[PDB]
Each structure stands twice: as C-alpha cells, then as structure tokens.
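Weekly modeling sync, notes
Attendees: AB, CL, MP (scribe)

Item 1: holo prediction request
CL wants a bound-state model with A1AV5 before deciding which constructs to order. AB pointed out that an apo prediction alone won't tell us much about the pocket. Agreed to run with the ligand included and paste results into these notes for async review.

Input as submitted:
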Amino acid sequence: SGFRKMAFPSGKVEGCMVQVTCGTTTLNGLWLDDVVYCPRHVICTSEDMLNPNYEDLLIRKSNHNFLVQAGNVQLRVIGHSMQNCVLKLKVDTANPKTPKYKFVRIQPGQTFSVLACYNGSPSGVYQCAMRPNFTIKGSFLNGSCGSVGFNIDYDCVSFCYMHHMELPTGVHAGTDLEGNFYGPFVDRQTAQAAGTDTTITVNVLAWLYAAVINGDRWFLNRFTTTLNDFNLVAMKYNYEPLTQDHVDILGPLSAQTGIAVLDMCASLKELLQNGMNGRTILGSALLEDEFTPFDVVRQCSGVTF
Amino acid sequence: SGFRKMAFPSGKVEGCMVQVTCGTTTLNGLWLDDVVYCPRHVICTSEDMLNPNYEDLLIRKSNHNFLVQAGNVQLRVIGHSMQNCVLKLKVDTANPKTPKYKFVRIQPGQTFSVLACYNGSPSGVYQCAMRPNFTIKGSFLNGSCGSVGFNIDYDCVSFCYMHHMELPTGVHAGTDLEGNFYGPFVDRQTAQAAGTDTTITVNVLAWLYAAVINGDRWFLNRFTTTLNDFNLVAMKYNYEPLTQDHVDILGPLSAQTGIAVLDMCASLKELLQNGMNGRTILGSALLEDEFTPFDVVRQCSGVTF
Ligand SMILES: *[C@H](O)[C@H](Cc1cocn1)NC(=O)[C@H](CC(C)C)NC(=O)c1cc2c(OC)cccc2[nH]1
Ligand SMILES: *[C@H](O)[C@H](Cc1cocn1)NC(=O)[C@H](CC(C)C)NC(=O)c1cc2c(OC)cccc2[nH]1
Ligand SMILES: COc1cccc2[nH]c(C(=O)N[C@@H](CC(C)C)C(N)=O)cc12
Ligand code: NA
C-alpha cells in the first residue's frame, strides 16, 4: 500500500554522465558507446547567445576545443558533428558502463525520470511528465543543461529528454536525443513563452484507479456518462479530451477495480463540477495528472528493472 | 527554478541489493563487504509468525538454508548471526561495489531516499520523512522487506532504514541497520497501531522558504508574530511546537531570502487560520512538511554527489 511519485532507479544513467567544456561554458553530456551527446549551445559565448549562427560557430571549433571529462579522466575527442540542437562528440573510448539503450521521442502526457546533474555529477532524481504545452515542470538551475530524462523498460534505458532552457514561467524546455525540441522553442536567448497548459485527463483517471486500488474510493458515484458528455465538461475545466484509445488503454485498470472507464469518468465529472470540498485523494488535495496508466500498474504490481 | 521532491541518485545502493530466500520466504538484502543484512523474519514460517523465538529458530537453521543471489550469481553463506531484528549472513565474497558507508539512526522529522526493491531488484526511488510517530508514508508491497532508506553526503552512503512492516492504516515501519525498530513496533504478523502523528513545523517553514526562492510569494504578509503567539496557534492545528533551535536551523534560509523566521511564522499562521483561498504553493494545495531545511538548500544550490 501507499502510492508515491516514484522515479526510476538512476544507476544505469549515472554511469553515462560526463562534463563537457568549450571555452568558458561547462555543461553535462551523455556518454554512450564512443559518442558524447550534449546541447550545442556549449559552443556559444555570452554574446553568441542572443542570435547564434550555430553552423558558423561550429566550423570555427576543432576537436581539441572540446574538453570532455568522465570523473577524473579526460576523454580524447576525435570527431564532432551537430544534429539539430545536439552536438555529437566522437571520443576514442567507448563507455564501459553503457546500458542497453534507445532514443525515443515521447508524446504529451508521458512520464519519465530526470537525473539532474551539474558539472557531470548527479544532484538527484525525480519523476515528471511532458505537459500538453510541451514543457516540463522540473527542478533545474543554470548549469543543468545536458541532464537527461529517461524511462527503463526491463534492462533497456529509453532516453527521451535532454535539458536546454528555462522559460519565463519557471518551466523547462528541451529536446529529444536527436536534438529536436519538444514544442516551438529555440536554443537562443530570445523572447519565448509557454502556451497555456491543460490537465492530462487519461492520467487523472489512472490515478483515480490507483486510489481505488488503495481503498480510497469516496468519490465513486452511481452514474455513468458518454465520452461526448464527459469531454464537454472536460473542456470547461482545461482538461485534455479523452479518446477511445485512452478508454481502451485504461481497460485493465477498469477490470482490476470493477469500475468501467465511463463510470470513472462520471465520478471525475462530479469532482470537476462540485470540487473536492476539502477532501483528499491519496493524500492530495488536487487531482494528480503525472501518473500514466502504466505507471500505476508498475507501482501497484512491484515491477522491477 | 522549480522545486520537486527529489531523491538521491540510487546507483551506489543499487550495487548492494541482493535477494535472500529462506524456506518459502524471499525478500531483499543489503550486501556490504562480506555481509548481507536483511530482516530476521525471513527465517520464520507461518506456524511461528505470531510470536517467534528467533534465538531458537536461528540455532536450528543451517547456512545452506539461505539462498543469496546477487543478480545471476549465488553467494555462498558461511555464517549467520542476529543483531536485534536484523540477520547478518556472512558470505565468502566481498561485494566489489561496496560504497563508502555508515549506519545511522535518524531523528523524527529528517528525510531519506527509499530504494523500493522486490526479489533483490529495484522498482523505484522516492523521498520519505521519518514521521514524529516513527512511521513512514511509503509505497511498499509484500516482498519489499529489506529495502533500505539512505542519505548521501559527498561519496558516503548513510543507511538509516530497513523495511519490515505495513500497518493497517497503510503506513510503514522498520528498523535502523542495527536492527532496532523506529517506534513501538515488533517484527510479528500482527496488526499494530502507531501513536498520534503531528506536523513537522520547521519543515513547513523550510518549504515556504523554498517557495519564496522559487518566486511563489503570494502568501507573504507584512506582519510578524512572537514565538509564543505562533505556537499558541500552531498547536491548535496539531503542529509541533517551534523551538529556538528550529529558528536557528532556519537561519541560513532566512538570511538568503531576507525574511526573518518570525515574519514567515506570521505568514504560516494566516495560512493555517484562513486556508489558501483556492491558490497553491509550489503546486500543492496542502502545506508540505517532508522537506528539511537542508533538503531545500541542497536542491536550490545544486549540490552533487
Ligand atoms: C543550461 O545549463 C541552462 C539550463 C537552465 C537555466 O535555468 C534552468 N535551467 N540553460 C540556459 O541558461 C539557456 C541557454 C540558451 C538556450 C542558449 N537560457 C535560458 O534558459 C533562458 C534565457 C532566457 C531569457 O533570455 C531572453 C529570458 C527569460 C528566460 C530565459 N531563460
Ligand atoms: C515484508 O516483505 C513485508 C513488507 C510489506 C508488506 O506490505 C507492505 N510492505 N512485511 C510483512 O508482510 C510483515 C511481516 C512480519 C514482519 C512478519 N507483516 C506485515 O506488515 C503485516 C502483518 C499484518 C497483520 O497480521 C495479522 C494484520 C494487519 C496488517 C499487517 N501487516
Ligand atoms: C480482472 O483483472 C484484470 C483483467 C484484465 C487485465 C488485467 N490486468 C491486470 C493487472 O495487470 N493487475 C496488476 C495488479 C494491479 C493492482 C495493478 C497485476 N496483475 O500485476 C488485472 C487485470
Ligand atoms: Na509575515
């Protein structure tokens, strides 16, 4: 029993973190096989920042201009290239701690763990979600760039996020490991803003199922709803639409608990229209949306890696 | 910016987790040098789980009865002894991944990371506070016994908790690594009750300082209170009395933000008496008490390990 915002064990990713320095800029890199991946803005000076021409700046750099340090060991850089907003530094040594890995681009609503790092060393690990507005609500200070987000599937680390920037509202933006930003953001010191965010409905439903699994079920009512009628209410409360695919993804949780998805939707509708009236669910006074259906099954089943 | 419940990187502890089986019972052990530490109830059967004579049971066990598995390798058990509620299995191989470590007994109100494990493998990592009533609010299923809690300081892992039990209320109980329970619990198959809990006032204040550091300032007011007047209010709300030692511990955060502790106390008094009027603090609609002052400083200053 209990239900917590749980991160993945971080050891497999800890063994891949290095420091990358170019000029006066130091940030984190990810060392997998004989390649180190990091944000390309490591090559910028403070002036370059406002309007960098990354292609021109990169032409001016040589392999020796990149100082890559894995703990106390300097790695020798033997090639470099840029892929979208990421630099790839080929080094002459493959990382002996490379886990089985993949690069994936995740969809809004999917969760992952972040290993926040500074100067190539880890500070801590936490779980977060890709928001509908393509930002993440992280904990990152200047210097954290190149920290990564990931999921673990058995023994395979799926890297999905690399950190690049903080937006004015204090939320975070970055890329996949091919260097393509999530959202419309760019890696320059310019005016940018997150769009209005919304609540991840399928995840709220998953967390309500977690509550029922844990015996916290005061909010279950005696009604049902249609997907249409539910979505009309969701729109009014800044919730994402629920699709039939979401309904089917929630099937096993609905069967485990005996509460059909559309019946849970009727209970959620009442929670939105009437509020929680000072009550909590799983210790929370708000409806939580950063657990996916699989996060619930994983945690309530004791899945290991 | 951003403030998250952040666990320590778990790799150093992952390298110490093993599976321990005796009879039909499998749980987790902690392998440090040539000793595996685990809950002693692994030796019991259902016939004696109600009140075991552990001294007699241990005499009747053979080293051969303990199956210890570190990943894909069986470790030969060459001796067994008991210290309070912890069994110590001497093995013929010293763990090459043993970190620098200490065993510590933590105080109520302090925090630690839990690496939840099943069958010697990790499921996830999350932060817990030791409650004033000597329970923790974790996420643990049958099979999680022997999972540990810890802090890291530089390169040194301080182990402080080993999991043994879930109470009827769904909170969790265990021992230090010398096998002494936190609180008035015993390692028997019985329903046990904790004493009444309280809110950790110094931690709530620390988290309000964290909110200010992260720009969430709406709850600040221009008023100050005396320590005595603050305690009269907070005790009605089942908050621990704030002592001058607590005020002193908050000194660094008070100096960083320029807000005296007794000024912040007047903001907390108003939050207690009036609520939040629909607003949130660091994304929460409740006052959070599971961050220590040190936890705030660590996260906001980017301490690494
Ligand atoms: C990289 O270590 C750092 C990550 C960070 C900073 O705070 C939290 N995380 N990223 C930057 O510092 C980043 C570098 C750019 C993309 C070249 N810049 C910003 O995040 C940034 C710039 C900026 C501006 O400039 C006009 C205005 C408001 C916010 C803001 N954030
Ligand atoms: C060990 O893996 C397991 C940990 C656990 C279980 O649920 C969450 N975590 N610990 C136990 O199962 C523990 C074994 C004892 C120490 C021998 N028993 C309990 O936690 C327990 C027993 C019990 C009873 O027994 C009648 C009634 C109500 C609650 C309850 N909890
Ligand atoms: C009638 O129950 C079902 C029907 C169809 C598919 C189902 N899947 C699960 C399923 O995964 N439960 C989890 C356990 C759960 C607490 C998270 C597990 N067994 O690990 C149940 C189920
Ligand atoms: Na005040």
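Recorded for review: Chain A touches chain B through 52 residues (CB under 8 Å).
Action items: CL to compare against the apo run; MP to circulate these notes.
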